Coordinates of C-alpha atoms and ligand atoms in Angstrom, one line a residue:
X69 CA 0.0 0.0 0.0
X70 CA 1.1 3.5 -0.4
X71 CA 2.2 5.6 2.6
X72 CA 0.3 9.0 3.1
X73 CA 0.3 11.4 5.0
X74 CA -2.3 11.2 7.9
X75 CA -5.2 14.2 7.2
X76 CA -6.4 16.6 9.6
X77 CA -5.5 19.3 12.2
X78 CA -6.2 20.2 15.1
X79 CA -6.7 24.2 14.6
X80 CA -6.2 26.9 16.7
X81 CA -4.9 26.7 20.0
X82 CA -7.9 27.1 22.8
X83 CA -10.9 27.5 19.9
X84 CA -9.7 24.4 17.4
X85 CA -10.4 21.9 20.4
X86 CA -13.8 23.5 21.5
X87 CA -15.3 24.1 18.2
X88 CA -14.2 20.4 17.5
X89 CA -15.8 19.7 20.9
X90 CA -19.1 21.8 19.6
X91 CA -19.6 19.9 16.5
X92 CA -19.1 16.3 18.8
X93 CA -21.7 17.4 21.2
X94 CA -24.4 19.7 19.7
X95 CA -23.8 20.9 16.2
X96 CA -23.2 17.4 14.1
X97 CA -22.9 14.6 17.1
X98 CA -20.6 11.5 17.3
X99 CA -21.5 9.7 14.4
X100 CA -21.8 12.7 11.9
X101 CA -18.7 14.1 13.6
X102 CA -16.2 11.3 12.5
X103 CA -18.1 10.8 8.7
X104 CA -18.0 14.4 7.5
X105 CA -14.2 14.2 8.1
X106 CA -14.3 10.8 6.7
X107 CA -15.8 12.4 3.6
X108 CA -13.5 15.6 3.7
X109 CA -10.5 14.2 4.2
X110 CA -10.9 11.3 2.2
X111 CA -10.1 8.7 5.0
X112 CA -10.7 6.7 7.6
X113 CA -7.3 7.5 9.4
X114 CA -7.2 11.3 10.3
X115 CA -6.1 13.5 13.2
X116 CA -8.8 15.3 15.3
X117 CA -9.2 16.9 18.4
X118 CA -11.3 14.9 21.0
X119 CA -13.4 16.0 24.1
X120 CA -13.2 17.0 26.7
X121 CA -9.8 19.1 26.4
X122 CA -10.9 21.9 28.3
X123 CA -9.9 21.8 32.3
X124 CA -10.3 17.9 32.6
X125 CA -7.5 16.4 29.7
X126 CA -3.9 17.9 29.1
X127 CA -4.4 16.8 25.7
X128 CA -7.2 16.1 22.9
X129 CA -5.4 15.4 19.9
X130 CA -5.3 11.3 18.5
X131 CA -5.4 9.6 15.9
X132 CA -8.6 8.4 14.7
X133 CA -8.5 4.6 12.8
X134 CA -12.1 4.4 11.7
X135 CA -12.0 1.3 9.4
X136 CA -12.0 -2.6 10.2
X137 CA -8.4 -3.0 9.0
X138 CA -6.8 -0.2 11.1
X139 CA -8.7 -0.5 14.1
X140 CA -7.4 -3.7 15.3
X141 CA -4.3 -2.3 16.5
X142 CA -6.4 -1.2 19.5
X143 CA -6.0 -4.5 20.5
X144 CA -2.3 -5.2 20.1
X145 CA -0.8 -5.4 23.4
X146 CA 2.9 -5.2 21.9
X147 CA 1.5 -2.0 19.8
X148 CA 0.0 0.1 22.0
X149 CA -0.7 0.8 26.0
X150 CA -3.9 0.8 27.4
X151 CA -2.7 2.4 30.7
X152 CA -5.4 4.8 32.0
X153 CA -7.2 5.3 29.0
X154 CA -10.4 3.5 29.9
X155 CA -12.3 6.5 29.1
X156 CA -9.9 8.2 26.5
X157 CA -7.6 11.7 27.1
X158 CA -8.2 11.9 30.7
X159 CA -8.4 9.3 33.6
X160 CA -11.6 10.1 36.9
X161 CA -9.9 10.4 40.0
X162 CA -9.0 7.3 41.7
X163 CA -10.7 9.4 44.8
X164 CA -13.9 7.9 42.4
X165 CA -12.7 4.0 43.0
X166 CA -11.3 4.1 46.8
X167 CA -7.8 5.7 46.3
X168 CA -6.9 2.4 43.9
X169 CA -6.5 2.1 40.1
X170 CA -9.0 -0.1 39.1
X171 CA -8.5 -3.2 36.7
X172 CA -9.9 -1.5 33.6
X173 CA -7.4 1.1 33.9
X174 CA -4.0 -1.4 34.3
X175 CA -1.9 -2.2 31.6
X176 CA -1.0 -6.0 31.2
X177 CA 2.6 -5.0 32.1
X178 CA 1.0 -4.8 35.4
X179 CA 1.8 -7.5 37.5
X180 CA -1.9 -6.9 39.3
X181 CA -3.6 -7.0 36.0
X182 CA -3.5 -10.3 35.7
X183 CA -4.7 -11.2 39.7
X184 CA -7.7 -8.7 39.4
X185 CA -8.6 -10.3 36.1
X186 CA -8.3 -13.9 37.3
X187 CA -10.3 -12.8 39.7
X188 CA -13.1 -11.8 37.5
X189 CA -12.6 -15.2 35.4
X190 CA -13.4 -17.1 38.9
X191 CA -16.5 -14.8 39.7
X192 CA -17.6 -15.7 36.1
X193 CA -17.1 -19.5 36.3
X194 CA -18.5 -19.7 39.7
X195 CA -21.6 -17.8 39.1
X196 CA -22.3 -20.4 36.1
X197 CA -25.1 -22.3 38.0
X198 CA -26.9 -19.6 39.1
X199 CA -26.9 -17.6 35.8
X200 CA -30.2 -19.1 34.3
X201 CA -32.4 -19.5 37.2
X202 CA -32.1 -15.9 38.8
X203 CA -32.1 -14.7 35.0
X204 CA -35.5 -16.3 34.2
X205 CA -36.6 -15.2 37.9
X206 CA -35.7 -11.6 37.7
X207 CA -36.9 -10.8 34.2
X208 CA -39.9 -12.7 34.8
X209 CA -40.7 -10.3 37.5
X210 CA -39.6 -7.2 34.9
X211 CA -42.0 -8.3 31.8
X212 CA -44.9 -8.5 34.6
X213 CA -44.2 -5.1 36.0
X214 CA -44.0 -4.1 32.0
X215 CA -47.3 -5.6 31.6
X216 CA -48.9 -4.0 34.2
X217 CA -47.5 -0.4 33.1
X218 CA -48.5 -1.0 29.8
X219 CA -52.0 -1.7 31.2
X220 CA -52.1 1.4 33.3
X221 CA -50.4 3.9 30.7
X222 CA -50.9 2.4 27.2
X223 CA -47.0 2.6 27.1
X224 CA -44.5 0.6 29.4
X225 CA -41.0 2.3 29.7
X226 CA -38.3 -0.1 29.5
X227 CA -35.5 1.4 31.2
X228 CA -37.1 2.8 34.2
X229 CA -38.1 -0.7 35.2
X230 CA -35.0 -2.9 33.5
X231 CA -31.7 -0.9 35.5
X232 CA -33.3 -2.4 38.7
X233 CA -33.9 -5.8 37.5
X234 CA -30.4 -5.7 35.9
X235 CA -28.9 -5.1 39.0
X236 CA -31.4 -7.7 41.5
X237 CA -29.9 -10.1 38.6
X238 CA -26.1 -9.6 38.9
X239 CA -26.4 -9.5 42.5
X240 CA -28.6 -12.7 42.8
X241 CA -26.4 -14.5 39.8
X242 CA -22.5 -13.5 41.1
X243 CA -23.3 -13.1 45.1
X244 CA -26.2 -15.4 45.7
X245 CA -27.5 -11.9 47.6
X246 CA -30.9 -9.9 46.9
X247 CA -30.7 -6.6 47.2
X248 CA -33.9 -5.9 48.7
X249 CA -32.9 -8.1 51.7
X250 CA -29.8 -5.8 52.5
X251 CA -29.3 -1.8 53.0
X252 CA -29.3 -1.2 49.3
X253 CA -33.2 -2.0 49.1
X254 CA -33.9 -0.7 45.8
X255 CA -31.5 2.4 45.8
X256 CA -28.6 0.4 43.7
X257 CA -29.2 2.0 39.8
X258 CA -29.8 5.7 41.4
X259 CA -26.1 4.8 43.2
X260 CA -24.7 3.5 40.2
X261 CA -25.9 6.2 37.6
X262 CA -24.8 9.2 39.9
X263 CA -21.6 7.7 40.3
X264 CA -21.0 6.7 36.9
X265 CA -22.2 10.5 35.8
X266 CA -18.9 11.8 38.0
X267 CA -16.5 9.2 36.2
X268 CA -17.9 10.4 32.7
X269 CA -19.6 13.3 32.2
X270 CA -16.8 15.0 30.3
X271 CA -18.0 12.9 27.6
X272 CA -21.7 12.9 27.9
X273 CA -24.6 15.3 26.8
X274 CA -27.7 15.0 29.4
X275 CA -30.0 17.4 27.0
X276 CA -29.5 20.7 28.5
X277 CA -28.1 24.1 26.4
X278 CA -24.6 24.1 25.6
X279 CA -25.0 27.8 27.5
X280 CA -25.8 25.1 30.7
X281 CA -23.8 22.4 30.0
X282 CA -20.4 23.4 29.2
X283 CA -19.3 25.2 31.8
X284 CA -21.0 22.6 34.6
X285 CA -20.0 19.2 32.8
X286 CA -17.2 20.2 30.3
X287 CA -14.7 22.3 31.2
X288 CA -13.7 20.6 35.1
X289 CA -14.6 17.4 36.7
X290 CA -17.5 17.1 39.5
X291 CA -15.5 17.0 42.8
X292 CA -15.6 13.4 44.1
X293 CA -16.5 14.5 47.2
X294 CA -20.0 15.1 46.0
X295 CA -20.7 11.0 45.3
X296 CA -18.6 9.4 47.9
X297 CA -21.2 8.3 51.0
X298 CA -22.9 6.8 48.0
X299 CA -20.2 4.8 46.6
X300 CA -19.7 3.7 50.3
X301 CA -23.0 2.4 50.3
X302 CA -22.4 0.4 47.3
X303 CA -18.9 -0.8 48.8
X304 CA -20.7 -1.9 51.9
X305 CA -22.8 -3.7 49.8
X306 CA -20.0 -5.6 48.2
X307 CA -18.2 -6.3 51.0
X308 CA -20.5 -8.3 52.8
X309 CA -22.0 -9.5 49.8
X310 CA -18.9 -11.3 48.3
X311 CA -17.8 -13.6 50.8
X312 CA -17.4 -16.7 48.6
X313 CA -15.3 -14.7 46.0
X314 CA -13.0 -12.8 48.7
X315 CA -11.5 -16.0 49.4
X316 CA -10.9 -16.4 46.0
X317 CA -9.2 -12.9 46.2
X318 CA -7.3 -14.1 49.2
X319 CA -5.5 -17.0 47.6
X320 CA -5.2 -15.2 44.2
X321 CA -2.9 -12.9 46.6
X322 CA -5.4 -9.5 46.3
X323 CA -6.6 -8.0 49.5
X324 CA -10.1 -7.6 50.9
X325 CA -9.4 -3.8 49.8
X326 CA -8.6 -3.8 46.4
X327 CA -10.6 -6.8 45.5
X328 CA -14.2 -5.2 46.8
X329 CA -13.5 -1.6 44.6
X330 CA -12.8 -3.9 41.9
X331 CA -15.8 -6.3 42.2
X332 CA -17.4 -2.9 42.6
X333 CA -16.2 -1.8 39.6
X334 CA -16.5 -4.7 37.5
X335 CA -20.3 -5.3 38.9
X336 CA -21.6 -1.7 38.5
X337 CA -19.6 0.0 35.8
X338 CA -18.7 -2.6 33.4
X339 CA -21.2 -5.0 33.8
X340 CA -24.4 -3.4 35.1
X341 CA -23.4 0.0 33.2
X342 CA -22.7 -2.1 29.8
X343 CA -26.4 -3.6 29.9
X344 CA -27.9 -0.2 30.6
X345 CA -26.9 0.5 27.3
X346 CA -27.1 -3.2 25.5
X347 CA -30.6 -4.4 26.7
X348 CA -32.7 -1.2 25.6
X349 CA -30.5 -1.1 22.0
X350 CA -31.3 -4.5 22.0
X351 CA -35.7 -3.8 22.3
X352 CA -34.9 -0.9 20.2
X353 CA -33.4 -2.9 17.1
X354 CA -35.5 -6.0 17.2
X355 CA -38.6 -3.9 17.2
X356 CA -37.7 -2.2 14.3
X357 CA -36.8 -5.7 12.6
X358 CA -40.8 -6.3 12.0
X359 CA -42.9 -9.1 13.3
X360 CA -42.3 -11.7 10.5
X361 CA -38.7 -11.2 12.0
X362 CA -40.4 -11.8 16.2
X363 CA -42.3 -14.4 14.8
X364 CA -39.7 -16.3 13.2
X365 CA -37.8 -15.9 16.4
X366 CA -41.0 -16.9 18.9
X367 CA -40.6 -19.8 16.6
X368 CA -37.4 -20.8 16.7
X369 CA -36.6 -20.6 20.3
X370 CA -40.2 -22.3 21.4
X371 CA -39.7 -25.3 19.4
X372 CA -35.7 -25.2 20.3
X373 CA -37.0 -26.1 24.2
X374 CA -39.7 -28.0 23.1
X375 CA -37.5 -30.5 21.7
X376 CA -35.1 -29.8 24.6
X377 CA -37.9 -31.2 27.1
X378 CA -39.0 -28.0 28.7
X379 CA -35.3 -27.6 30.1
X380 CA -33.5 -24.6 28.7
X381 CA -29.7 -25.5 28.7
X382 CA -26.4 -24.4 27.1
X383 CA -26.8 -26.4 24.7
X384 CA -30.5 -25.6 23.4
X385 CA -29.3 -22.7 22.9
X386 CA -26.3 -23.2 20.6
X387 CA -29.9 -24.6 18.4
X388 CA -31.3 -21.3 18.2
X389 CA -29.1 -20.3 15.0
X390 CA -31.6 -16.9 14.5
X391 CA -31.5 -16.0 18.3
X392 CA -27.6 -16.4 18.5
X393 CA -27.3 -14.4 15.0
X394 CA -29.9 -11.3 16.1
X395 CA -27.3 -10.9 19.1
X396 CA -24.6 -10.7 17.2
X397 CA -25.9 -8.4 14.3
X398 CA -27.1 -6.2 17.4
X399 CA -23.6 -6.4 18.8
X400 CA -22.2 -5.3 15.4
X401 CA -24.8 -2.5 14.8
X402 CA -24.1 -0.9 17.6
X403 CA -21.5 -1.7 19.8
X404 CA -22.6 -0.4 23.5
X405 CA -19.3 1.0 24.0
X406 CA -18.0 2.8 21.2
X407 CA -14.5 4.5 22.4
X408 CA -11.4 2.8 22.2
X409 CA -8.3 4.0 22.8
X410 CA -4.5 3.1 22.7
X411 CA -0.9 4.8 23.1
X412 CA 1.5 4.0 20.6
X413 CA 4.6 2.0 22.0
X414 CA 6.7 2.5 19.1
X415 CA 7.0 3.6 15.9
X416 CA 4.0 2.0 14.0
X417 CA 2.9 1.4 10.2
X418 CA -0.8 1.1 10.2
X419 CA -2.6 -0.5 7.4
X420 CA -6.4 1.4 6.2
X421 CA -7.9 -0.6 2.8
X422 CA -6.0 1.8 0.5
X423 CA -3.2 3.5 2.3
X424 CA -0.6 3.2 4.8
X425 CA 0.1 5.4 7.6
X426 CA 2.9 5.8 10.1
X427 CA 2.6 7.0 13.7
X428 CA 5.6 7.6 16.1
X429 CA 5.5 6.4 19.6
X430 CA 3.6 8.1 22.4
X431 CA 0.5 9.0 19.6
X432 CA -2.7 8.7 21.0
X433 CA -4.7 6.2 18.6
X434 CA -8.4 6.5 19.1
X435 CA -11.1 4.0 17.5
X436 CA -15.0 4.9 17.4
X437 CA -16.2 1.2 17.2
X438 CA -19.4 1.2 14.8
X439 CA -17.3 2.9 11.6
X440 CA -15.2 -0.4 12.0
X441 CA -17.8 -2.5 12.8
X442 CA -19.9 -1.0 9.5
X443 CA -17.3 -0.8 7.7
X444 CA -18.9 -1.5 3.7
X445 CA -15.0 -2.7 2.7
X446 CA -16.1 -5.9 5.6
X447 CA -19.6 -6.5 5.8
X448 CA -22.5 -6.1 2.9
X449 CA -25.3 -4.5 3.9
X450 CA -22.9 -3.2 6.7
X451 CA -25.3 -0.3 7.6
X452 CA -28.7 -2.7 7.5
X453 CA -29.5 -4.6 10.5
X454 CA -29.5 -8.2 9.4
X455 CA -31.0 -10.2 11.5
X456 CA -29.6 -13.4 9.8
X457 CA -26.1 -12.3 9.1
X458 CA -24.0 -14.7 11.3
X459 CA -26.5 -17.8 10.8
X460 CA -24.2 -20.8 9.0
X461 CA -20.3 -21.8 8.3
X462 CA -19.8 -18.1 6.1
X463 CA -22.0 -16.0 8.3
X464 CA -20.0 -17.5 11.4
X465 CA -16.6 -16.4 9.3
X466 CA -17.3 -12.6 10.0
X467 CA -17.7 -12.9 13.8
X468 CA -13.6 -12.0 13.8
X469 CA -15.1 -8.5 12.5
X470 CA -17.3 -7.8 15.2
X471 CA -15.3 -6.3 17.9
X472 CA -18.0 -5.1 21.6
X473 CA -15.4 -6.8 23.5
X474 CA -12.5 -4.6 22.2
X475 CA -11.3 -7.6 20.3
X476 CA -12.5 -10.1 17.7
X477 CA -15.3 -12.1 18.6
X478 CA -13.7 -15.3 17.5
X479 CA -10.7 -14.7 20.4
X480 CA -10.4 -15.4 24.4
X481 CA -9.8 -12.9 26.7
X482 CA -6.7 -13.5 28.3
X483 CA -4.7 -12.2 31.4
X484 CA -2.6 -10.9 29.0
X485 CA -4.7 -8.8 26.1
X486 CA -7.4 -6.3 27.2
X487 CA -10.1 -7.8 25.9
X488 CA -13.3 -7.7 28.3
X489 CA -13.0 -10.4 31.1
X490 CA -16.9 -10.9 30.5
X491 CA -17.3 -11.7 26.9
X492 CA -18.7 -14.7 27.0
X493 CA -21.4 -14.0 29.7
X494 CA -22.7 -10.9 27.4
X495 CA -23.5 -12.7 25.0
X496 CA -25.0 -15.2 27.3
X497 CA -27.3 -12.6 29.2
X498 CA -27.9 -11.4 25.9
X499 CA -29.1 -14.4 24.5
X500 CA -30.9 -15.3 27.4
X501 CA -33.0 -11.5 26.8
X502 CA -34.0 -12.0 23.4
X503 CA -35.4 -16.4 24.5
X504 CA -37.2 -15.0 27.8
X505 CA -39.0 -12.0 25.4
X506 CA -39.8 -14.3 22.7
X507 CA -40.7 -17.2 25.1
X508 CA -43.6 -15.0 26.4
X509 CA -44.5 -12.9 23.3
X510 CA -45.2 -13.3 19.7
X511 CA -44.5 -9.6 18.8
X512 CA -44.5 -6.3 20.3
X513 CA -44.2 -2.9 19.2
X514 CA -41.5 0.0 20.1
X515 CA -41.5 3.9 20.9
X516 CA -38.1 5.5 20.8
X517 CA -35.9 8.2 22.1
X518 CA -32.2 9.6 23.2
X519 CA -30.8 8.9 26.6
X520 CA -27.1 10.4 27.7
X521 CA -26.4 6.7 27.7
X522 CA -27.8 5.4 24.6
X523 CA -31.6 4.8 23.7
X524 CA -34.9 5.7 25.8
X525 CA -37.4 2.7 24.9
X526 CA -40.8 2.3 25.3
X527 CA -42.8 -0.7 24.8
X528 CA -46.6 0.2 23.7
X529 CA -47.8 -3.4 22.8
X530 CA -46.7 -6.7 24.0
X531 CA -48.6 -9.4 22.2
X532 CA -48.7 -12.7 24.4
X533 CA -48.1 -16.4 23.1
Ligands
LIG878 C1 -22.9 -5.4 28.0 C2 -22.0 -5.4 29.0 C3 -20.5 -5.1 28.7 C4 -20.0 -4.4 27.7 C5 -20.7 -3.6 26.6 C6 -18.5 -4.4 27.9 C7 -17.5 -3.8 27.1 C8 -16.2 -3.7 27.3 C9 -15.2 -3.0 26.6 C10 -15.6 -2.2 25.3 C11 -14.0 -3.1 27.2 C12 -12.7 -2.5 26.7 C13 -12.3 -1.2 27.6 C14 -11.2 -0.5 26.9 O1 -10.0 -0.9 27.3 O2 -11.4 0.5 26.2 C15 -14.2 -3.9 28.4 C16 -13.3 -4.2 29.3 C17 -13.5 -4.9 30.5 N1 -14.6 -5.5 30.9 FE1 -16.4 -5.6 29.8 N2 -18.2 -5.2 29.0 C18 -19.4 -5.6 29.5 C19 -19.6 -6.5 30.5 C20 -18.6 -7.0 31.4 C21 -18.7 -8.0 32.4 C22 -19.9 -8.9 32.6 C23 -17.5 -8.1 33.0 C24 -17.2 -9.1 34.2 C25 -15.9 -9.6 34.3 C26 -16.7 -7.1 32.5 C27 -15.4 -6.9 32.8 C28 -14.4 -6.1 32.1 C29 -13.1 -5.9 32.5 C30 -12.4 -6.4 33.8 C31 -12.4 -5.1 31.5 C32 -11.0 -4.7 31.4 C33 -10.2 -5.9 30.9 C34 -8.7 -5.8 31.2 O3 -8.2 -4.9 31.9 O4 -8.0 -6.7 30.6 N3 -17.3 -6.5 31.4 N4 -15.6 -4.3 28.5

């Protein structure tokens, strides 16, 4: 390939970063943002300034790779660092997650990277027998209560009911523990979102003017101060909560300490917060695939436990080639967490479709998932939602090009890559989502808005079996 030069600037000092920062927030939006200098720059590898700048990062500019071939390097451990660039250009406080830095934010140079993350692979494996009874429990309880609104109101709003399930679920699945029999009571998703607002609103929009939001969620960070008795209600929570996995800690050589934040963490930012985004997405995108499209599903998994006795098992599901697909095509669509980022090591040559382009070390490479994940040059039809795309041996090929778990789907996460310790238990829960709506209901029908974090949904007709 030929080398070019990479595109873009980053303007004038002060006023290039904030009128980049205008156009990301209120005047084109993420997706628009990163096309139009797709289309002017005629690339998909480009320099541009990223938010928040401002008071909260020393430093906006990276490089954007914003095609299925160059975004991989995200991934390559010996390529770049992913130390403290969870959430891009600047890092939360670690006042935020009990004076430690969390396992998100570690390099796999760090010695404590791979404990913390074992840790997480035992929490996963030892949860496995709870997984589908306190799933089909819990969400049992939800499509009642959704019922019942939709009774009431002639519209049933998903996430106002589904962030407490969500949460009654993980803790029920990973700590055998139900909230509403501790201190948390129902108080948990209130917890979590104000907390996760002061780790990342630098980065969101919550609807107000720019006039309003700029100077009071752009330009410094909310002091920590302000969310801290409620994180230590969570802690508490977690502490006495986790028993069986602190011994797990103890012999992987983590303290009682630093294991709890990071349970915390894991439980409530990645987990909890990562379905806050996926499951309405998820109603959202189905719905708009058409009843022919529920039906055939409603189908498919129905006579899949029919013929599996009543029982549904692992391996029932592995049947349900449409089911397995639809989560996988939502998945690729739109990936719940679109911002990866990486710090070049070394010199690199990165490889787009028709150029090459060279970065020195210490560059700040920056990947917005769903341009990689869309990418025409990969997938056809890469911006229709397919329902079937991944059924059979060639559908099943282009799983390696569909990257939620910041890496292909076809890989493992290791303790030595940075792929999401959780992979396979998304897709899982996932799965388990689309077989407990479609186990109940024959159709239903959607109402849709914006949310700081993704998609408002309402359901406003649930047709039963
Ligand atoms: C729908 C829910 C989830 C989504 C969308 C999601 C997505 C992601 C993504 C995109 C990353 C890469 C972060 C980066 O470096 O930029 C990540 C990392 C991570 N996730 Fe997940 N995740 C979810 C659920 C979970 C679950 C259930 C666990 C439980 C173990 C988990 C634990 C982790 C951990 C520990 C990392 C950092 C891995 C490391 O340091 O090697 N996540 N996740």
């Amino acid at each position: 390939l030929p080398i070019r030069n990479i595109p873009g600037n980053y303007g004038l000092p002060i006023v290039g970063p904030i009128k980049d920062r205008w156009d990301y927030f209120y005047d084109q939006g993420a997706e628009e943002f990163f096309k139009s200098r797709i289309r002017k720059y005629n690339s998909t590898v480009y320099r541009v300034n990223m938010p928040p700048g401002a008071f909260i990062a020393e430093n906006p500019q990276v490089v954007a790779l914003l095609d299925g071939k160059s975004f991989p390097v995200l991934f390559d451990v010996d390529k770049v660092e992913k130390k403290d660039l969870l959430t891009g250009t600047y890092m939360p406080s670690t006042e935020l997650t009990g004076g430690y830095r969390i396992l998100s934010y570690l390099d796999p140079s760090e010695p404590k990277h791979e404990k913390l993350k074992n840790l997480l692979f035992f929490l996963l494996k030892s949860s496995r027998n709870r997984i589908f009874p306190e799933f089909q429990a819990t969400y049992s309880e939800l499509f009642d209560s959704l019922e019942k609104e939709l009774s009431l109101k002639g519209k049933a709003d998903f996430g106002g009911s589904s962030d407490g399930t969500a949460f009654n679920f993980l803790a029920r699945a990973f700590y055998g523990t139900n909230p509403a029999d501790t201190k948390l009571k129902a108080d948990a998703p209130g917890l979590i979102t104000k907390w996760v607002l002061f780790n990342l609103h630098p980065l969101l929009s919550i609807g107000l003017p720019r006039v309003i939001e700029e100077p009071l969620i752009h330009t410094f960070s909310l002091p920590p101060a302000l969310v801290k008795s409620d994180y230590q209600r969570l802690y508490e929570f977690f502490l006495e909560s986790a028993g069986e996995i602190l011994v797990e800690a103890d012999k992987l050589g983590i303290s009682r300490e630093e294991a709890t934040h990071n349970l915390l963490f894991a439980t409530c930012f990645n987990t909890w917060g990562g379905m806050k985004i996926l499951f309405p997405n998820m109603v959202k995108r189905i719905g708009r695939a058409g009843h022919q499209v529920h039906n055939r599903l409603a189908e498919e998994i129905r006579s899949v436990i029919k013929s599996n006795g009543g029982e549904l098992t692992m391996g029932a599901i592995e049947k349900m080639e449409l089911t397995k697909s639809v989560v996988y095509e939502c998945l690729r669509f739109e990936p719940p967490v679109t911002a990866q980022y990486g710090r070049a090591k070394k010199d690199l040559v990165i490889e787009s479709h028709d150029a090459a382009f060279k970065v020195k070390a210490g560059e700040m490479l920056y990947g917005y998932q769903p341009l990689a994940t869309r990418d025409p040059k990969i997938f056809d039809r890469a911006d229709e939602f397919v329902p079937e795309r991944f059924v059979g041996e060639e559908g099943e090929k282009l799983l390696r090009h569909v990257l939620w778990s910041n890496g292909p789907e076809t890989e493992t996460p290791t303790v030595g890559n940075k792929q999401c310790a959780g992979k396979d238990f998304v897709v899982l829960v996932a799965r388990l989502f689309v077989i407990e709506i479609f186990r109940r209901y024959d159709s239903f029908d959607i109402e849709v808005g914006t949310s700081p974090l993704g998609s408002s949904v309402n359901f406003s007709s649930l047709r039963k079996a």
